[PDB]
Design a protein around this ligand. Structure first.
Ligand SMILES: Nc1ncnc2c1ncn2[C@@H]1O[C@H](COP(=O)(O)OS(=O)(=O)O)[C@@H](OP(=O)(O)O)[C@H]1O
Ligand SMILES: O=[N+]([O-])c1ccc(OS(=O)(=O)O)cc1
Ligand SMILES: O=[N+]([O-])c1ccc(O)cc1
Ligand SMILES: O=[N+]([O-])c1ccc(O)cc1
Length: 294
């Protein structure tokens, strides 16, 4: 029943390209009923959502890794806009029956994140990642994830990415929207590259934002269990439990490489020069900055 939605071109919701299966019945998102205690993990796709979601869940579980092995991360931190009509309950439905504090994953740009989150002051942990690594990660994700329109060749996908035609729209607008919105809302704005550089330093910031005090032993336990190698090999986080019909893990694993700088292996000399020139144009006039190497 979900098959007719898979591998279809993007729909559009409020002007933003959307995964085809997610777009029907968008009222369930516009009218989502949030709670003041909800913690939103918001990201442009492929920017560290799963990484930060696991950190948050481990903090809320007191640093106990066994409690995070209870279920897969797709169920522990439901995506707000997820839907697979006819095969699974929507993410919004699953969230309705989840005890506070809920951890809510989403890729929606700030201006179409449901109004209830803004009205309830919900804590948002935002993660940004440099756009070149994001583009590489999202291309390979679209090769393996059958919810996505097929991406074609890398060069054509990159053009679509730069133009903001991909699911969830323009990366530039996404990262700058949440950077600006912190002026009116409690947002912790994290960088994937910072997390590669010093993971404990970023876990500590997440714990403080959540009001949670970590012993040194719990901090080391969280850092040890949220390394790329740990989450790649952990069935609860590596998405290997997703049916192969939805995610072909042999095309490209979800936990694919986990580095900063893989863009140097995929961007041609010409693509890189052109991207850098466009990026400088699009990022002029913001103080927000990303690192492409650490
Ligand atoms: N612990 C840890 N350390 C380092 N890197 C990590 C980690 N967990 C996930 N990743 C990498 O993040 C990419 C997945 O991003 P998301 O989780 O945002 O994907 S999604 O939007 O939720 O589908 C994807 O990046 P790439 O490997 O570059 O494709 C994952 O490998
Ligand atoms: O993709 N980025 O995030 C990106 C690209 C270029 C850039 O600066 S440059 O000096 O390498 O052009 C910084 C960040
Ligand atoms: O996080 N996710 O599972 C995703 C992310 C992007 C996308 O286009 C579809 C699903
Ligand atoms: O939980 N799931 O089955 C999923 C979740 C996200 C996704 O992109 C594809 C499948």
């Amino acid at each position: 029943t979900v098959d007719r939605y898979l591998r279809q071109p993007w729909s559009v919701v409020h002007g933003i390209p959307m995964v085809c299966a997610f777009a029907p019945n968008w009222e369930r998102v516009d009218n989502f009923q949030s709670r003041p205690e909800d913690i939103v993990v918001a990201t442009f796709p492929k920017s560290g959502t799963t990484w930060v979601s696991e950190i948050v869940d481990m903090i809320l579980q007191g640093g106990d890794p066994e409690k995070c092995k209870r279920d897969a991360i797709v169920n522990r931190v439901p995506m707000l806009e997820f839907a697979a009509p006819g095969e699974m309950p929507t993410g919004s439905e699953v969230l309705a029956t989840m005890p506070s504090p809920r951890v809510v994953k989403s890729h929606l740009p700030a201006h179409i994140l449901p109004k209830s989150f803004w009205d309830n002051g919900c804590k948002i942990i935002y993660v940004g990642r440099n756009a070149k690594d994001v583009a590489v990660s999202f291309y390979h994700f679209d090769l393996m994830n059958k919810f996505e329109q097929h991406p074609g060749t890398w060069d054509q996908y990159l053009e679509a990415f730069m133009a903001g035609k991909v699911a969830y729209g323009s990366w530039f607008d996404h990262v700058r929207g949440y950077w600006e919105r912190r002026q009116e809302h409690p947002i912790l704005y994290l960088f994937y590259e910072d997390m590669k550089e010093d993971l404990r330093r970023e876990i500590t910031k997440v714990a403080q934002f959540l009001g949670q005090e970590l012993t040194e032993v719990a901090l080391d336990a969280i850092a040890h269990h949220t390394s790329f190698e740990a989450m790649r090999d952990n069935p609860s986080t590596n998405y290997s439990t997703v049916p192969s019909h939805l995610m072909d893990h042999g095309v490209s694993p979800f936990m694919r490489k986990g580095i900063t700088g893989d863009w140097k292996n995929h961007f041609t000399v010409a693509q890189n020069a052109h991207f850098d020139q466009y990026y400088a144009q699009k990022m002029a006039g913001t103080d927000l900055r990303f690192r492409t190497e650490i």
